[PDB]
Amino acid sequence: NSSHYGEFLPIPQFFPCNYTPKEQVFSSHIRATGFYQNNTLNTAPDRTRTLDFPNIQH
């Protein structure tokens, strides 16, 4: 009885027209390699919210 599960070989008829699988190569790479880490030293230029280094004179 249980030979009936795979008696018939696959036929290209019995298949859906659409076939859109998942693609995880790009995700697997960025999962295998970590999402950045701060061991760097602080380097940000000093800035003023009104004007950056005016030409104050006289």
Binding site: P10, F14, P16, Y19
Partner: peptide, 14 residues
């Protein structure tokens, strides 16, 4: 999105 498949010797339809 993917529609169901059908098996040879099955009872259902596409």
């Amino acid at each position: 999105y993917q529609p169901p498949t059908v098996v040879p010797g099955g009872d259902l339809a596409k």
